[PDB]
Amino acid sequence: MNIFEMLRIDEGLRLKIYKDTEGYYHIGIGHLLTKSPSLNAAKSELDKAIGRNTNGVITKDEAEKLFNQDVDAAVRGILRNAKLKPVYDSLDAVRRAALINMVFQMGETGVAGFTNSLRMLQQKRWDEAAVNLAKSRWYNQTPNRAKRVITTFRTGTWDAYKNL
């Protein structure tokens, strides 16, 4: 298991434009196209992202290219952020993946807003952090995914992603 496989489980893979669980246009492995309700706006975004005039459908290699960029961007979001970088630095590589997962789903600014959660993670108070992380819009709206990420923080193991 690693961050790529983890996010492939949590996000799925679709080769045509789809709406994610927020109702926003996406493609591939959880690649956000736009928060606009306009499908045409989403398709322009897609063409811009791929570099060609698509028909709203990409190949698996193209989806994996965007995914590889998006994972890279979630780390960039963490390492450039004064709140996220010290927590990441402090974590083992398995818990690092859980933090990348959150930033992939919610973005840098949103995960930086988990001030109290981040403090408990930096303190290595894993059960307390897990309780605090669940008191969120994130957990209520995507509970099974948040439970997997939270178990990863709580235990420092991949147990929530094995059998899947």
As a whole number of angstroms, the distance between CA 90 and CA 106 comes to 21
Q: Specify whether 10 is catalytic.
A: no
Window 20-39: contact mask with Cl ion (x via CB under 5 A): --------------------
Q: Is 52 in the site for Cl ion (CB under 5 A)?
A: no
Q: Which residue has the tokens 């403090």?
A: 119
3-state secondary structure of 26: strand
* DSSP structural state of residue 27: E
CA end-to-end span of the chain, whole Å?
A: 10
Residues 102-121 that bind Na ion (CB under 5 A): 104
Window 20-39: contact mask with Na ion (x via CB under 5 A): ----------x------x--
Q: Specify whether 22 is catalytic.
A: no
3-state secondary structure of 73: helix
As a whole number of angstroms, the distance between CA 116 and CA 129 comes to 8
Could you tell me which stretch among 9-17, 44-52, 55-63, 95-103 binds Na ion (CB under 5 A)?
9-17
- Give residues in contact with Na ion (CB under 5 A): 11-12, 30, 37, 104
Please list the active-site residues: 11, 20
